[PDB]
């Protein structure tokens with residue numbers, strides 16, 4: 001629900017789909033890769 | 049803007065267009 005913000009202070013809510021997009025950005029992938037493929041990543045994750 | 053889910057409609061301001069024109 002809040003990613004990593006609650007470990008440094010107050011828990012700050014953000015939608016999870018947006019949490020995943022920041023995480024791809026942290027590894028050098030542009031954030032539209034998730035937003036345009038949200039269903040594919042969620043379905044592939046669920047099987048994995 | 050027809051593949052991302054959750055898009056909202058809003059105006060994006062370009063600073064060049066007004067001043068230039």
Ligand SMILES: *[C@@H]1O[C@H](CO)[C@@H](O[C@@H]2O[C@H](CO)[C@@H](O)[C@H](O)[C@H]2NC(C)=O)[C@H](O)[C@H]1NC(C)=O
Nearest residue numbers: 049050051052053054055056057058059060061
């Ligand atoms: C965001 O703006 C677009 C463009 O004006 C809207 O698309 C129109 O939506 C109406 C129905 O609400 C349709 O009758 C039109 O044919 C659509 N236009 C096009 C070019 O497809 C879109 O609905 C807006 N989104 C919201 C949430 O209001």
Ligand SMILES: *[C@@H]1O[C@H](CO)[C@@H](O)[C@H](O)[C@H]1NC(C)=O
Nearest residue numbers: 015017038052053054055056
């Ligand atoms: C968010 O969930 C509501 C139902 O609580 C739904 O109607 C809406 O379409 C959802 N928004 C997005 C962007 O999926």
